[PDB]
Amino acid sequence: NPVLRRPPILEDYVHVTSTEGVRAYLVLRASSHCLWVDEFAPRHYTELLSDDFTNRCLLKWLKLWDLVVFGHERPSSHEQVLEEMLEAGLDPSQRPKQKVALLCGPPGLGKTTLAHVIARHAGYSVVEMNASDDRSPEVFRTRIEAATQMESVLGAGGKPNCLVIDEIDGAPVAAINVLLSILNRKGLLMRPIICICNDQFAPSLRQLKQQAFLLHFPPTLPSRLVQRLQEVSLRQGMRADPGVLAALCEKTDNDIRACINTLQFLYSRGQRELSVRDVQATRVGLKDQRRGLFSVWQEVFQLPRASLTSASQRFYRVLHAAASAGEHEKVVQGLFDNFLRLRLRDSSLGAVCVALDWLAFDDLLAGAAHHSQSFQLLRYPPFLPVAFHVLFASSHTPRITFPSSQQEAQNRMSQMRNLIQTLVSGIAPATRSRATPQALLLDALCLLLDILAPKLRPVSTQLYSTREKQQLASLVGTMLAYSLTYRQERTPDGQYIYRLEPNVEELCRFPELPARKPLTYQTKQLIAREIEVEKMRRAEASARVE
Amino acid sequence: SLWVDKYRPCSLGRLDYHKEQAAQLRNLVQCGDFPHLLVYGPSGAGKKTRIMCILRELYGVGVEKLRIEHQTITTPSKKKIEISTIASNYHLEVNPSDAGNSDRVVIQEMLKTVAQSQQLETNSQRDFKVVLLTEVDKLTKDAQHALRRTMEKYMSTCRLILCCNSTSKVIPPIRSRCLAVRVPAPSIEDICHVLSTVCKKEGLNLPSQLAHRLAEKSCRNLRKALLMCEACRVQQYPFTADQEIPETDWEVYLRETANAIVSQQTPQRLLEVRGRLYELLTHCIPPEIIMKGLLSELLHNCDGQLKGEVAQMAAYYEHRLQLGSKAIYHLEAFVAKFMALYKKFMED
Amino acid sequence: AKPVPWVEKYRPKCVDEVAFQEEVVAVLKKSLEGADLPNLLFYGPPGTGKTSTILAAARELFGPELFRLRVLELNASDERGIQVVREKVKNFAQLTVSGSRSDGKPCPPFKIVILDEADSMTSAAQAALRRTMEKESKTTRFCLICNYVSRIIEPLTSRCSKFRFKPLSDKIQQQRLLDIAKKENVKISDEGIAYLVKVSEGDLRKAITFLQSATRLTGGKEITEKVITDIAGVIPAEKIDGVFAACQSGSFDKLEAVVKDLIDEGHAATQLVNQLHDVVVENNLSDKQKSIITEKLAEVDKCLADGADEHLQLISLCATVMQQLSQNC
Amino acid sequence: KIRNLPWVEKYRPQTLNDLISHQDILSTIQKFINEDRLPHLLLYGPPGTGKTSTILACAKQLYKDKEFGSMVLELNASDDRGIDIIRGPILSFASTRTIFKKGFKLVILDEADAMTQDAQNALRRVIEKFTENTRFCLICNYLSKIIPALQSRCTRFRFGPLTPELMVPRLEHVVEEEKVDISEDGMKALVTLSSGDMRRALNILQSTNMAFGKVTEETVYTCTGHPLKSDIANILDWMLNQDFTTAYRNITELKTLKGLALHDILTEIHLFVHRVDFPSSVRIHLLTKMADIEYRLSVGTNEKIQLSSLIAAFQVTRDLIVAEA
Amino acid sequence: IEPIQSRCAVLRYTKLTDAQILTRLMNVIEKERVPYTDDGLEAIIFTAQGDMRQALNNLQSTFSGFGFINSENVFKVCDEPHPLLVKEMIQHCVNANIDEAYKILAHLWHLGYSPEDIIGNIFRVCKTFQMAEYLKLEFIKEIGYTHMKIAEGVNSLLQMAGLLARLCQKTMAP
DNA sequence: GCAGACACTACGAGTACATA
Ligand SMILES: Nc1ncnc2c1ncn2[C@@H]1O[C@H](COP(=O)(O)OP(=O)(O)OP(O)(O)=S)[C@@H](O)[C@H]1O
Ligand SMILES: Nc1ncnc2c1ncn2[C@@H]1O[C@H](COP(=O)(O)OP(=O)(O)OP(O)(O)=S)[C@@H](O)[C@H]1O
Ligand SMILES: Nc1ncnc2c1ncn2[C@@H]1O[C@H](COP(=O)(O)OP(=O)(O)OP(O)(O)=S)[C@@H](O)[C@H]1O
Ligand SMILES: Nc1ncnc2c1ncn2[C@@H]1O[C@H](COP(=O)(O)OP(=O)(O)O)[C@@H](O)[C@H]1O
Ligand SMILES: [Mg+2]
Ligand SMILES: [Mg+2]
Ligand SMILES: [Mg+2]
């Protein structure tokens, strides 16, 4: 017991007394010259390892250019749109309407191989433009104008030039604008252009996606890749089971180049029979995958299907995958926008409360790291997706959408701030000082709009009364005091409407509120005409005074 | 012009309420050695009117000749940020919170160039200039720390009048350097007298019942009371005692948001309330006022043994909102905590 | 002949005019005699006289003609980044010490770098001051002025000799205020000056500002306690009694009414927290109730220091003290 | 001759024998110097322990005064140490010979924790490739701000806090060189308030000698403003032994008379709490409440309310300790 | 990046074991004629923590400073690794043993470690500790909450003791 | 002897990120 009723004899003591007055005592005291990827690279169309639908679509898209390039009439879901694009006809300048074939997918699938093989198969000469070039817009323009706007030096019998632009995702936005300018110049384009990227959702390729023949690469089929690795190992005199090759294929995430390089390192010549444990070892062949956002959100919000059933393994897997994804703010926005639409079993809302506490913890960490220049506070917000995985683990199949609420909220807030700054700029400086824009927004906007809309009958000005004319003059004066006016707007339905030149109705009005009676067309036109003649007579009065 | 601007008093002898404070402020600024001023009080109490009356007492009538001055201020990131200042030949009005988080650059550069130069004319003008810093409670603490040495170095040639709503957001170094002038809200009788004198100056008759209801609904805000009285005269020229008073749209939207909160306690209703709070935040409504309106409406639907916990939760999440940067997280956290508490109270 | 506010009219022009800070005044007077002045760190509450003491010491060490050559003042009103410390401070610290006083008074063989408001200086910019202070200590001295010593890094804390400025006691503050009122030919009663030194809470700048403002409001006659109470924003005790009666009633509607009446009257929430604490620690409540009410008062004061809304913090504090007062009933 | 210097710079250990505490580390570095096998050093520890003075004494021992400017390249946090400085002046100093006399050169990077990670990653092969030509000494207060590659490349010596039994002879040397009248309790107050910091020991000694003229316990605790241990014992007795009002009055009177600060009171009460045989839950509650009160004092708060909360944190646990029995 | 790693055979090296470092240390000792004992080489391995550079540096420092390799000569110039005691500090915090956790904290405080290094080692231990997942998450959140206060400017022994007391409470508050 | 062209470095500007 830490508390003694009797005082200590030898050790030092400190007295404790309660409110009722009883003392307590506490103790104070050339086979060997080339790589295996280069040796077994495909040189014909029949030995490609990609999906056959993508190869056929790219070959048919490149054979639609034979009308304008080779001068011959005869060449010899996501699938439905591509089949519609191959049969939608040609433009009046005898060219396809999509002049760029855009190739996207994860690395090691064969996009560059498919582009080069399909270009050499259709009788073109491959012009390669990669990320090791200068990529400045002047050099980009010069290279594309050299590749696409001239004939061949060899004359008749010379191969046409098909421009293949590798790594277009890393290109600057001005280079993409140069490519789109030479794409849509009506100096007319006559040669096909192929663009290859690893990420289709790059910000620089947004306008390129709406104009190109988008060919998304699926991951390679494990049976075909296992057969190709078996053929490569049989050519090199190496023995391997289908099981260990399938283990290598699922280890390398269906990467052809990584699997062949891993086999080239693992075989050598000391041993022939490859073992399962060498592939299962993490020392050779494991590479850090850049996981997508939707895979991370699925891995967080859905448990894996049935070892791997331990909770700590899922904890570390979710943490490492969310760290390896990158773009942490987008992950946090997806977690914030997707965790309430799940089939939540927590009806007491405690999990939602502690998830929002974790989100506020991440926000406070971001603010403190960006305030005190102490960026060692950013090792904790990687544990936010694993917190959401622990709280909201389910065996169901959730529908994850892309986060858009916070960005739309920021865009609308910026638009409303611009509208507020436009509204206060028209007011006179004598009345600008009397109220802040915040107080004018909170107090003097909806009531001001109630002032500016009186109960006015559709009657001409000559039949009005004295009170009606005084009220109309006061209304026009108060409308001119805040630099407000009504102007016509054109509608697609065919009618004309009058609207405020600063549209301050959207600053005030809200969607779920009951509707109020608006001013009619005749009254608003009369108000605008009265504002114009009030400006005219104000100029006349200013001329008469001065 | 509206009724908020047409009948504003010009000098300290024409103020309808706080007349003893008006005489004290007249006696304060007569000699010219008065210190820096911190005019604080609730919104719509009449702080800016008394500041302009103090400027009318110091200089002549030329302080009413105002003009818009546009200033371009360079950040340390070399980004040009535009701010606007209202200035006269005798004073300047600056709102540094319009620059956002770069208000410290505005204090360090724009105010120091004003304070470091004396006035051109010393006969029509006095020996010192006045700088009006409006809404200093919205300033960050870095800008307030930049403010304090300029207030002491150049206080013989440049005086400062700081205006705010709450002095708790003002740091104690700034509050130690200035005299705090408290302007309370006008009472129901004062607002009724002001509205009656405005209606008598307009040739109208205002009943005592309608004036009392306008004073009660305005929450002792004379600006909003005058705006509501002019809206009631555009809506109906016979001033009836039981005439309806128009309401602001964001207040009734907040009331319907809180009614949607108390109607159902589900994550789907939480998503709908988050959408409503996004709609409130996009219209440039401050989130502390959203918290105040939510607490003002949620406590009407609570029982007597539940209101204290909801008020403590609202204060805690508003403090976390002030500490943080994304308001929607703390707003949804407060709504989720209230939904959990309300479900626990209803099921037990 | 322009009038000047009394905080600048009665600023200490010498070390002997500094009040109540006896240890640092003795150290600075020994440095006036010719002793070895170390690097200084001044911290404490606002208005205790950290800036005026070092400015008076510098103007007594160097005089009028050498104040522009030996004193470099950098504060938060000017830009103090990492490059300002690397260029402006370091090149000033490497300058030669030359120039002599023309009045025959002795001059110390160093410069003084005054870094006022060192809280706002970043941790990276504070790290560049370390070897600048160590290497150039033969020819310059450094005085750091701050309010919170935790906002200065531990190497700069270890490098400077720390001097904490205490809040001024009632005797010294009353003596200084009576001397200022004697020199300004104004009269103030003993109850008025007692309430003034109770209100000012050791802030002599606040006391001088309140005395000057009460002189201007009064006009020249006797300054009573009522003008001091009205000019300080002190909440009347009837409002505090009404708040505690609404808490003893156990109803939240009267609590909302008294909170709205105190907010609409413009009373600052810090003053209300101080007065509620003064009533709470000096009544017949039990120890547990007083304990959690004072802890809630500390939490509310912390939240008000971080710029939270006054209405919600005051209604949360009132709900807590209402629960404590109605728990035993 | 006499110089106008602070006593932390007037009395600096120019030789390695004038340092007091880390005898094993200094003996190993001296045997590194005598055998001419000096490795890349990483000196880390709390401030004021003698990391800069050690490498300055080593640099003065290795090199003469007629060759010191071309043999030692000393860069600290007051200088620009970006990645263009690593690729520029540091690499050109490391990759070249000397001018006057042949020998290995030294690069002293004081306050190496303030360097960027790009510069630290660029420093790796400069250290590794030119080991025979130059040596690099890294000084920091935080080992976590130096990358593990530079921690592997340099052998690390921890310059820990100086024990108070070893700070006494150096303080006595400074006292007998400055003609200071000091008693035994003044020395105990110096070595207690220093807490393993020789810099602030000399700072408190100089400020107390200038402020009062003698260095005793009362003069040190008056010039520093630190509370006496009897005052802390009285505060703990009042907080644990009587009601809220009398404890508040007595602690407020003690703080008004002695001129105490709540930060040092909180620090000494925190030190006193672990010595008192509290229950575990009471100790956890007291530590959490005292950490909350210490965090609240870092902003513009009222110290009286925080003092009342400090009293409250023990007035809560009075009944719990007594009812534990 | 992933395209570069696909273009290369990615080899991953693990930390060297005790015998693998010990063989190279025996080679260096037999090349340098260094007198030694077994427990001194075990101390060199313990201070190495899988690093051959640190093993060679500690061996050369112990041989130059003392001329003999036993445990006391190694531990007089080298140091025990930091997280090897932070692990049992976190273990005591799991069982709500505040006294032993504060004993380890005060022992690390008196050796001169800054609060940032101590809380970094605390987070490093808590990241891979063997306990419940929700308890680990709230532990990490409390560590980040204290680290924000440490980076804000307040960093004392009372703050670390309050962090340890909060970590002990998080166990007793299910 | 003076106007036009060539590349030269210093400087302005835009953008990313900072943890384990
Ligand atoms: N059928 C195949 N059999 C064997 N190796 C192949 C086969 N198809 C492609 N490869 C090789 O696998 C690799 C495919 O990568 P590439 O097509 O050059 O580039 P990519 O597939 O677009 O991926 P990135 O984004 O450029 S890294 C190359 O090394 C090819 O030689
Ligand atoms: N100890 C004092 N003796 C005499 N006058 C004082 C004293 N303290 C303050 N004053 C007066 O109050 C004014 C303010 O003094 P300051 O030196 O600015 O206080 P401070 O320590 O700088 O406050 P902060 O922390 O900078 S906000 C001075 O100009 C004097 O008029
Ligand atoms: N071991 C020591 N022996 C004698 N005097 C010392 C010792 N350590 C520090 N000092 C004194 O304190 C002064 C500063 O010592 P420094 O070497 O600068 O300490 P430091 O370890 O470099 O601390 P940091 O990390 O650079 S702030 C010296 O000039 C001496 O006066
Ligand atoms: N003494 C008074 N008499 C009549 N109207 C007043 C008086 N004081 C203020 N008002 C009106 O109340 C409103 C208060 O707004 P303002 O003066 O900007 O104070 P605040 O800055 O507190 O909102 C003003 O529009 C003004 O017309
Ligand atoms: Mg490729
Ligand atoms: Mg100051
Ligand atoms: Mg140093």
- Domains, chain D, in order of start with CATH, read 4-162 (3.40.50.300), 163-226 (1.10.8.60), 227-317 (1.20.272.10)
Q: Is ligand 2 within 6 A of the CB of residue C244?
A: no
Q: Which residues of A294-308 are buried (b: 16+ CB within 10 A; e: fewer)?
A: eebbebbbbeeeeee
- Separation of alpha carbons A182 and A149, rounded Å: 10
Any strand F atom closer than 7 Å to A170 CB:
no
- DSSP strand pairing (B91-94 vs B129-134): parallel
Contact D19, D48 (CB under 8 A): no
Distance in Å, residue D92 CA to nucleotide F18 C1': 28
Q: Do chains B and E touch (3 or more CB pairs under 8 A)?
A: no
- Number of H-type helices and E-type strands within chain D: 17, 5
Nearest to A261 among E8, E134, E141 (CB): E8
Domain E17-80 has CATH 1.10.340.30: no
Those residues with Cβ within 8 angstroms of residue A531's Cβ, 6 or more apart along the chain or in another chain? A476, A479, A480, A485, A486
Which tokens belong to B194? Answer: 């002001």
- Between CA E165 and CA E168, with CA E167 as vertex, the angle to 5 degrees is 65
- Separation of alpha carbons D205 and D182, rounded Å: 10
Q: Which of E102, E126, C44, A294 is nearest to D260 (CA)?
A: C44
Bridge partners, residue B80, by sequence: B74
Ligand nearest to the CA of A259: 1
- Which residues numbered 5-64 in chain E sit less than 7 A from strand F, measured from CB? none
- Separation of alpha carbons D134 and A497, rounded Å: 82
Amino acid at A331: V
Q: Do B256 and B167 share a domain, yes or no? A: no
Secondary structure (3-state) at B134: strand
- Separation of alpha carbons B239 and B232, rounded Å: 8
A451 contacts in B (CB within 8 Å)? Answer: 2, 227, 230-231, 234
- Separation of alpha carbons A78 and A96, rounded Å: 19
**Residue B238: inside a domain:** no
**Residue B254: inside a domain:** yes
Q: Do B175 and B265 share a domain, yes or no? A: no
- Separation of alpha carbons A393 and A363, rounded Å: 23
Which tokens belong to D138? Answer: 């890294």
Q: Side-chain half-sphere of A339: how many Cα atoms within 13 Å?
A: 29
Q: Which of residues 20-59 of C touch D (CB under 8 A)?
A: 23-24, 26-27, 30-31, 35-39, 45
Which of D15, D49, D108 is the best mutation target for the ligand 3 pocket, counting ligand atoms within 8 Å of the beta carbon and taking the most?
A: D49
Declared resolution, Å: 2.8
Q: Do B295 and B169 share a domain, yes or no? A: no
- Put simply, whether E157 touches C (Cβ < 8 Å) is no
Contact E85, E73 (CB under 8 A): no
- Separation of alpha carbons A10 and D130, rounded Å: 65
- Separation of alpha carbons A56 and B100, rounded Å: 56
- Separation of alpha carbons A496 and C177, rounded Å: 75
- Separation of alpha carbons E59 and E74, rounded Å: 8
Treating both helix axes as pointing N-terminal to C-terminal, what angle do E157-172 and E115-127 enclose, rounded to 10 degrees?
20
**Residue B9: inside a domain:** no
Which tokens belong to D268? Answer: 């000494």
Nearest to C266 among B145, B182, B316 (CB): B182
Contact B151, C77 (CB under 8 A): no
Q: Do B162 and B65 share a domain, yes or no? A: yes
Q: What is the CATH number of the domain that holds B292?
A: 1.20.272.10
Any strand F atom closer than 7 Å to A328 CB:
yes
Any strand F atom closer than 7 Å to A382 CB:
yes
**Residue B313: inside a domain:** yes
Q: DSSP readout, B28-78? A: HSSSS---EEEEE-STTSSHHHHHHHHHHHHS-GGGG--EEEEEEEE-TT-
Structure-determination approach:
cryo-EM
Amino acid at A326: G
Burial of A440 (0-12, 13-18, 19+ CB in 10 A): buried
Q: Do B42 and B129 share a domain, yes or no? A: yes
Which tokens belong to A372? Answer: 């005190």
Interface test with E, best of D26, D49, D288 (most E CBs within 10 A): D288
Maximal CA-CA distance, chain A? 116
| Domains contained in chain B, number | 2
Q: Is ligand 2 within 6 A of the CB of residue C202?
A: no
Q: What is the CATH number of the domain that holds B24?
A: 3.40.50.300
Burial of B282 (0-12, 13-18, 19+ CB in 10 A): middle
**Residue B301: inside a domain:** yes
**Residue B63: inside a domain:** yes
State which residue of chain A sits closest to C286, comparing Cα positions: A19
3-state secondary structure B281-321: HHCCCCHHHHHHHHHHHHCCCCCCCCHHHHHHHHHHHHHHH
With an 8 Å Cβ cutoff, the interface of chain C facing chain E consists of 148, 150-151
Ligand nearest to the CA of B161: 4
Burial of A156 (0-12, 13-18, 19+ CB in 10 A): exposed
Those residues with Cβ within 8 angstroms of residue B157's Cβ, 6 or more apart along the chain or in another chain? B115, B118, B119, B127, B128, B129
Bridge partners, residue D134, by sequence: D105
Any strand F atom closer than 7 Å to A323 CB:
yes
Q: Do B177 and B276 share a domain, yes or no? A: no
Q: Which residues of B215-226 are buried (b: 16+ CB within 10 A; e: fewer)?
A: beebebbbbbbb
Contact D212, D287 (CB under 8 A): no
Q: Given B182, B212, B227, which residue is the final one in a domain?
A: B182
Contact A96, A86 (CB under 8 A): no
3-state secondary structure chain E: CHHHHHCCCCECCCCCCHHHHHHHHHHHHHHHCCCECHHHHHHHHHHHCCCHHHHHHHHHHHHHHCCCECHHHHHHHCCCCCHHHHHHHHHHHHCCCHHHHHHHHHHHHHCCCCHHHHHHHHHHHHHCCCCCHHHHHHHHHHHHHHHHHHHHCCCCHHHHHHHHHHHHHHHHCC
Segments in A274-327 forming alpha helices (H): 276-280, 293-301, 311-325
Q: Do B177 and B253 share a domain, yes or no? A: no
Segments in C201-280 forming alpha helices (H): 204-218, 225-231, 237-249, 252-264, 269-280
Q: Which of C281, C321, C266, C282 is nearest to C299 (CA)?
A: C321
Q: How far is D324 from chain A (nearest CA, A)?
A: 7
**Residue B191: inside a domain:** no
User: Where in the sequence is the domain holding B287, given as residue range(s)?
Assistant: 249-347
The CA–CA distances, whole Å, from A268 to A58, A255, A264, A271, C124 equal 37, 20, 6, 7, 53
Q: Which fold has domain E81-172?
A: Zinc Finger, Delta Prime; domain 3 (1.20.272)
**Residue B79: inside a domain:** yes
Dihedral Cα B257, B260, B261, B265, nearest 10 deg: -160
Q: Which of B31, B160, B11, B19 is nearest to C216 (CA)?
A: B31
- Separation of alpha carbons D319 and A3, rounded Å: 12
Q: Do B175 and B294 share a domain, yes or no? A: no
Any strand F atom closer than 7 Å to B70 CB:
no
H-run or E-run covering A419: helix A405-424
